[PDB]
């Protein structure tokens, strides 16, 4: 809009270009996201308006929803870097465990908040986890997936990553529960620790099979009702579960215990954000300052 001066392009978003901009009135710097045409369905407008109310220290603040000239612009709080870039920058040495714990702890607080309001993300990934120089990490784009379905490709034709997608989604479950977000966060937790994506699938079946080879092909024992899901196939190969000691070294026993609970197949058995915050893994949690060189 005319009220904002585009400083620069932050990157390509799921729904449209993302710009760093300055409000010509408050002088504040923000993140402007254009959402991609008939006239914007009232459903999306109402949903997004509700998002302006779910405010939390670990949720990127939605400053304004600008709907003008039949176009949508979301104005968000600006943060200088995302977890994906931070992880890439810390490849040689890896994010210190204390910071990993702090980040997971804060992220769970964010999920617990949104989940308590029955709002889920559905597309959590390192790219939408933002951090600042003070040791904070925040979840970006929360609640947008429900307002605008998550596409296979972005407006730039970029392939939306499947790496953090929960198995119930891959198996065709039409109704998502807050458990999908815990799954994603579990995958992210494992990636920060090992410095390598847990399940880097490059297709839905490849993603599903990578999960199967690590956690074992799910059956009626560990996941009641799984064999009756839309995309389940009795012909799926049968792989045996691997031991977490092999999956995420050198994560200690508390970490492995919590990760296992965040990666449970049955969405109903998967640990909640609230319960995870009480896990012994966070007994010695602190808030370290990450070293960022902007």
Curated annotation (Swiss-Prot):
Activity control note: Phosphorylation at Thr-14 or Tyr-15 inactivates the enzyme, while phosphorylation at Thr-156 activates it.
Active site: 123
Lineage: Eukaryota, Metazoa, Chordata, Craniata, Vertebrata
Marked site positions, CDK7 binding: 9, 84-85, 162
Binding site for Mg(2+): 128, 141
Species of the source: Homo sapiens
Names of required cofactors: Mg(2+)
Binding site for ATP: 10-18, 33, 77-79, 82, 125-128, 141
Name by which UniProt lists this protein: Cyclin-dependent kinase 2
Positions where N-acetylmethionine occurs in the chain: 1
Mutagenesis or variant effect for residue 162 to R: Reduced phosphorylation by CAK and reduced kinase activity
All copies of domain Protein kinase, residue ranges: 4-282
N6-acetyllysine, modified sites: 6
Family indicated by similarity: Belongs to the protein kinase superfamily. CMGC Ser/Thr protein kinase family. CDC2/CDKX subfamily.
Enzyme Commission number(s): 2.7.11.22
């Amino acid at each position: 809009m005319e009220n904002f001066q585009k400083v620069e392009k932050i990157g390509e978003g799921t729904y449209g270009v993302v710009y760093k901009a300055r409000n010509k009135l408050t002088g504040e710097v923000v993140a402007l996201k254009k959402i991609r045409t008939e006239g914007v369905p009232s459903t999306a407008i109402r949903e997004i308006s509700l998002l302006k109310e779910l405010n939390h220290p670990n949720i990127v603040k939605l400053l304004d929803v600008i709907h003008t000239e039949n176009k949508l612009y979301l104005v968000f709080e600006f943060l200088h870097q995302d977890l994906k870039k931070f992880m890439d920058a810390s490849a040689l040495t890896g994010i210190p465990l204390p910071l990993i714990k702090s980040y997971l702890f804060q992220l769970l607080q964010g999920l617990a908040f949104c989940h308590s309001h029955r709002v889920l993300h559905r597309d959590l990934k390192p790219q939408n986890l933002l951090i600042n120089t003070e040791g904070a990490i925040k979840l970006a784009d929360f609640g947008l997936a429900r307002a605008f379905g998550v596409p296979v490709r972005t407006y730039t034709h970029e392939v939306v990553t499947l790496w953090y997608r929960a198995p119930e989604i891959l198996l065709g479950c039409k109704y998502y529960s807050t458990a999908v977000d815990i799954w994603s966060l579990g995958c992210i937790f494992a990636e920060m620790v090992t410095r390598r994506a847990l399940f880097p699938g490059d297709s839905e079946i490849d993603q599903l099979f990578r999960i199967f080879r690590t956690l074992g092909t799910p059956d009626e024992v560990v996941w009641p009702g799984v064999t009756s899901m839309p995309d389940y196939k009795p012909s799926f190969p049968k792989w045996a579960r691997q031991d977490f000691s092999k999956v995420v070294p050198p994560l200690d026993e508390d970490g492995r215990s919590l990760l296992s609970q965040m990666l449970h197949y049955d969405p109903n058995k998967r640990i909640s954000a609230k319960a995870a915050l009480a896990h012994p893994f966070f007994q010695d949690v602190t808030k370290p300052v990450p070293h960022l060189r902007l």
